[PDB]
Amino acid sequence: LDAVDAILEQWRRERPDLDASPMGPIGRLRRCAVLMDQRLESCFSRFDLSSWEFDMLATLRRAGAPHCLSPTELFSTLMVTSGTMTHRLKRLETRGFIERVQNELDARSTLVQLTSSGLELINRAVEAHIENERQVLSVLPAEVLAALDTNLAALLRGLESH
Amino acid sequence: LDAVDAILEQWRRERPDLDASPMGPIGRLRRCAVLMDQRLESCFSRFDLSSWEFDMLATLRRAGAPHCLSPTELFSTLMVTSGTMTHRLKRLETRGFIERVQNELDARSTLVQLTSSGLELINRAVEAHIENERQVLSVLPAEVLAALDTNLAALLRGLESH
Numbered sequence: 001l002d003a004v005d006a007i008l009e010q011w012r013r014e015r016p017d018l019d020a021s022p023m024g025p026i027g028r029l030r031r032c033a034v035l036m037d038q039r040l041e042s043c044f045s046r047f048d049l050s051s052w053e054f055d056m057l058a059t060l061r062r063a064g065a066p067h068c069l070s071p072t073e074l075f076s077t078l079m080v081t082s083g084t085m086t087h088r089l090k091r092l093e094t095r096g097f098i099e100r101v102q103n104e105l106d107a108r109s110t111l112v113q114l115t116s117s118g119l120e121l122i123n124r125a126v127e128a129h130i131e132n133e134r135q136v137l138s139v140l141p142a143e144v145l146a147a148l149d150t151n152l153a154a155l156l157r158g159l160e161s162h
Numbered sequence: 163l164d165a166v167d168a169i170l171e172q173w174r175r176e177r178p179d180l181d182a183s184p185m186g187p188i189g190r191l192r193r194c195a196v197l198m199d200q201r202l203e204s205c206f207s208r209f210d211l212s213s214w215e216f217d218m219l220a221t222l223r224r225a226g227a228p229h230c231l232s233p234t235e236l237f238s239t240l241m242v243t244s245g246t247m248t249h250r251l252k253r254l255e256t257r258g259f260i261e262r263v264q265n266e267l268d269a270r271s272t273l274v275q276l277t278s279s280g281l282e283l284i285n286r287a288v289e290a291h292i293e294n295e296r297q298v299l300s301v302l303p304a305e306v307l308a309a310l311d312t313n314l315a316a317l318l319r320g321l322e323s324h
């Protein structure tokens with residue numbers, strides 16, 4: 001048994017009138033995601049990056065040269081969505097990783113361009129990030145990791161179809 | 163394909179020298195967990211509770227009457243771990259949901275006791291939370307949800323064994 005089985009056993013004792021079985025899968029998902037985040041940010045911290053900072057920089061990098069995206073395009077291609085980007089983009093601009101250039105097709109619009117400093121940083125960070133993620137998943141059998149990847153895609157399909 | 167497949171395809175184009183396949187399973191895990199959190203907090207908000215507030219209250223509730231736990235016991239039985247509990251416990255005390263009583267076995271120690279207000283709140287919140295989680299998972303086939311639950315337990319086993 002694990003810590004989520006112990007929690008389900010606590011609810012079998014405290015609220016026997018309720019069926020708390022849906023807590024199982026969701027609890028393990030959220031518990032794994034928090035522990036996974038600690039493993040990832042232990043690598044991101046070597047570059048003075050948070051998780052959202054790496055996400056925004058890697059998203060601009062994935063767009064290809066000249067690594068310039070609109071805020072709408074940037075938001076839609078992030079690995080994980082979140083709240084507004086106003087303050088997060090403002091901090092990345094202060095650190096010199098991104099610059100807000102004026103859209104040539106609309107003067108009253110702005111575009112997000114990865115600077116040459118953020119480009120050199122994100123190219124080094126993505127290399128260490130990939131190797132770090134490989135070490136984390138390395139402890140699982142290949143058949144289990146492939147099944148978890150497929151079952152997570154099924155869960156993601158239902159969440160985004162909502 | 164999904165949004166994580168599109169990201170993996172972006173890395174196949176931008177860094178063909180790198181193998182970014184470990185990004186797949188971890189990206190879907192973190193993407194699902196964020197979308198799952200939005201579905202959960204859409205129910206927690208009806209009770210003026212955040213995710214960590216529900217976690218701490220449900221943990222004290224799971225301990226059984228008189229719903230009194232030490233900070234070490236409280237931390238070890240939370241669904242998801244996090245940083246320090248100093249400020250989070252201080253806010254719950256201001257809202258009247260918990261009170262810090264003195265340990266009778268150690269005067270220089272404190273215990274966390276769920277008040278009668280937090281007890282009535284968490285008993286109503288856990289009922290709606292369980293029904294909410296059932297509706298979220300209801301869209302998946304039974305065989306897929308059971309396999310995802312087992313594969314997540316395998317992932318959790320490796321993360322906590324680290």
Ligand SMILES: O=c1[nH]c(=O)c2[nH]c(=O)[nH]c2[nH]1
Nearest residue numbers: 051054055058059079080185
């Ligand atoms: O291209 C990315 N790969 C990731 O693994 C990742 N993780 C994250 O948060 N953003 C991104 N972006």
Ligand SMILES: O=c1[nH]c(=O)c2[nH]c(=O)[nH]c2[nH]1
Nearest residue numbers: 023213216217220221241242
């Ligand atoms: O008993 C709990 N069930 C949960 O589903 C849950 N989720 C959470 O964050 N804390 C808790 N506690």
